[PDB]
Design a protein around this ligand. Sequence first.
Ligand SMILES: [Mg+2]
Ligand SMILES: [Mg+2]
Ligand SMILES: [Mg+2]
Ligand SMILES: [Mg+2]
Ligand SMILES: [Mg+2]
Ligand SMILES: [Mg+2]
Ligand SMILES: [Mg+2]
Ligand SMILES: [Mg+2]
Ligand SMILES: [Mg+2]
Ligand SMILES: [Mg+2]
Ligand SMILES: [Mg+2]
Ligand SMILES: [Mg+2]
Ligand SMILES: [Mg+2]
Ligand SMILES: [Mg+2]
Ligand SMILES: [Mg+2]
Ligand SMILES: [Mg+2]
Ligand SMILES: [Mg+2]
Lengths: 63, 226, 97, 25, 127
Amino acid sequence: TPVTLAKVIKVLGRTGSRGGVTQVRVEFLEDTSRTIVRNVKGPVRENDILVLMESEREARRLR
Amino acid sequence: AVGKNKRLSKGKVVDPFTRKEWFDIKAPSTFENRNVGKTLVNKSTGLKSASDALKGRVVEVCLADLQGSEDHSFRKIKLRVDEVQGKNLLTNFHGMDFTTDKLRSMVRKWQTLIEANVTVKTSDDYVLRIFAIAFTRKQANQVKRHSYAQSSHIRAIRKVISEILTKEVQGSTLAQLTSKLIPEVINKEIENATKDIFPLQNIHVRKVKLLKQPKFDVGALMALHG
Amino acid sequence: PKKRASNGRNKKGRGHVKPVRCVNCSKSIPKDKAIKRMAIRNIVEAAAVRDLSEASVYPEYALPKTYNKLHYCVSCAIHARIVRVRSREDRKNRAPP
Amino acid sequence: MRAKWRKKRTRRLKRKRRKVRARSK
Amino acid sequence: SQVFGVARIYASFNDTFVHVTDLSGKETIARVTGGMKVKADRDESSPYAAMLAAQDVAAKCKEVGITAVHVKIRATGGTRTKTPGPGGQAALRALARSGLRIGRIEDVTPVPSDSTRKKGGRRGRRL
RNA sequence: UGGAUGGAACGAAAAA
RNA sequence: GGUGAAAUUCUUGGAUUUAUUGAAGACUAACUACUGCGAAAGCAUUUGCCAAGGACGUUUUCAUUAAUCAAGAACGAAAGUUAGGGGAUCGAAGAUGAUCAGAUACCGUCGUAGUCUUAACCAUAAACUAUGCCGACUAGGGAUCGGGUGGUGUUUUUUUAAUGACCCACUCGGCACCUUACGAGAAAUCAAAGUCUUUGGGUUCUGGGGGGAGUAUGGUCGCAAGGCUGAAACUUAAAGGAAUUG
Ligand SMILES: [Mg+2]
Ligand SMILES: [Mg+2]
Ligand SMILES: [Mg+2]
Ligand SMILES: [Mg+2]
Ligand SMILES: [Mg+2]
Ligand SMILES: [Mg+2]
Ligand SMILES: [Mg+2]
Ligand SMILES: [Mg+2]
Ligand SMILES: [Mg+2]
Ligand SMILES: [Mg+2]
Ligand SMILES: [Mg+2]
Ligand SMILES: [Mg+2]
Ligand SMILES: [Mg+2]
Ligand SMILES: [Mg+2]
Ligand SMILES: [Mg+2]
Ligand SMILES: [Mg+2]
Ligand SMILES: [Mg+2]
């Protein structure tokens, strides 16, 4: 059960039917220069660190 | 939908790649490169003789690989397998064609498209159908924004293209023609023949399609692969 | 009363226009009345371009295009967040955005 | 009700009256 | 120096097909579809499903010996949508990230010259 | 240089 | 495979998929636009044959031979009928799976008649520009199609000529478009829906509150569905058009 540590670099905005989810552009601690866009449940700012059960999934961006 | 089978068997394991071996495809002399690719088939058992399964196969390869230069980027080429010579199965020409993305980029609105086809026959009893395509050009100092043809220039241009294709194929066998089309001299002729009618930028020819084959005559094919 | 000068199409002097089929609901609609759009889009993305470019042979290959024309019925066009509506006098405006 | 279906109903009613009249002559 | 295969992604709606074949195309290798790696009947075209299948087929490719692949994307075509599905695009990025090499991508969606008839009736699909 | 369709929802006595 | 989500359906007798061929029928994509032709319906692959047509050019001919039309006549979308052929795709009826209180409806899978063609019929449409035809006059702007004229204009041929394709100017005939309203209108709007109380260029057709009713009856055409002409008794104070505020 490997995991991945990823660093938030820029928040996009709220998303979801009820505004309880946040879109963030997060950047991996290891093997840098790769940025992915993921959804976050709870309160979050920039510069936080997330742990991911998997890395290969890019959430549906609304822009 | 993994568990969706109500019934898997109307009435009521072996790895297949341990039985399969590779083969190297060879192109005729009229190409800068000769090494095309590699292909898989089963054991040529006493009941199959896999050379039979290879006899009527067709492989599509981009021309840019065959010539090295990237200007022939789109330019698909179709090659037909004909003879198996010790893991170096041989191929000859079967058809040329354009790539959809290019073909669609050819056609834009606010200009006139001109198309023509022909069913000429070669000296080698080969029966070929060749297609040609053209679009009108707005010259420098153009002010009007559409630049259409007058439907009689189109008739003349199509007549010229039709006759010139025949006069370029009659007498020619096949390979000269292949080496005429690799440097695209045919379309080079078109504007020289039509510049007194209408501009006609961008006169790439089209796909070419084969229709009828004569008897095999192994020796001619062997001549291409020295 | 009359709502548009062309009455919703571009037919003046024809009578019949040889209709086509909507791409979404397959409703029949005259060609000129249709709401044709041109969809030119690069094949992959604006995101995975870096991945494919580095993980591909032929450096700086082509990244070619893709071209589809779309035809929507009036109802589908409105329902798919396109040109939806405009105000009374603003409807006369012809130019694109 | 819609005019087209009015016309269709009337057409049927006329057809029925026609045949019932032809039943006697 | 290199070994090529041919991808032939079928990027339809409601499902996604990935199977690599020999350069001739008569011999196929490791046909896996998104619908056999999930149990939803609604996610058969989901990008996650297509990505996960693409990793599987890439595994078979790598263990057989194909290292690079030529790409042929195609939609349903004919009289149908003619636009690529959602998961096929994700699958392409998946198998590309899996380790193989990519060259000469083309679109081969079957487009007609004004074919017979689109289903749905004159007045269209009403919903 | 982007991108989503997306379930069900009948009726309201007469006059002012 | 299908949807919002599923199911009917097909799959170890190998479905969906991939390659090489072959057959059948339908269509003529992208080029395709406030562009063209036709009396209207309508007409989009190439080439050949047959006849037809508008506009332009004209110091050619006849000489008023003309405009509109009761009666009468040709053409006339789709659907439909009769008899052959063809019969891929789609698909009224129908069979089936869903949703729902019910759902013989919308949604899904099949599926006869039909969709195509030959020989005949039928003669209707929101057949719409809801604006009859001919003739004259009245405000400005550009663009476009066909033809003709002028210009040391550009490009290409053979620097060069004639051509051709463009540029500038002009004109005739078209499909229209942009601004304004002297003018018209109840208004929406209109270069005609203007030159109408300061009421008259020529001419055909239609209407007199809403229903009953395009019904009944009588003629006439058709094998049939139906078409053309077309009432009355009785009932009712409002129906209706365009705009304003909610
Ligand atoms: Mg209204
Ligand atoms: Mg009409
Ligand atoms: Mg009740
Ligand atoms: Mg009730
Ligand atoms: Mg099979
Ligand atoms: Mg065409
Ligand atoms: Mg034209
Ligand atoms: Mg008259
Ligand atoms: Mg009528
Ligand atoms: Mg009328
Ligand atoms: Mg007049
Ligand atoms: Mg002119
Ligand atoms: Mg003019
Ligand atoms: Mg016109
Ligand atoms: Mg009266
Ligand atoms: Mg009355
Ligand atoms: Mg009103």
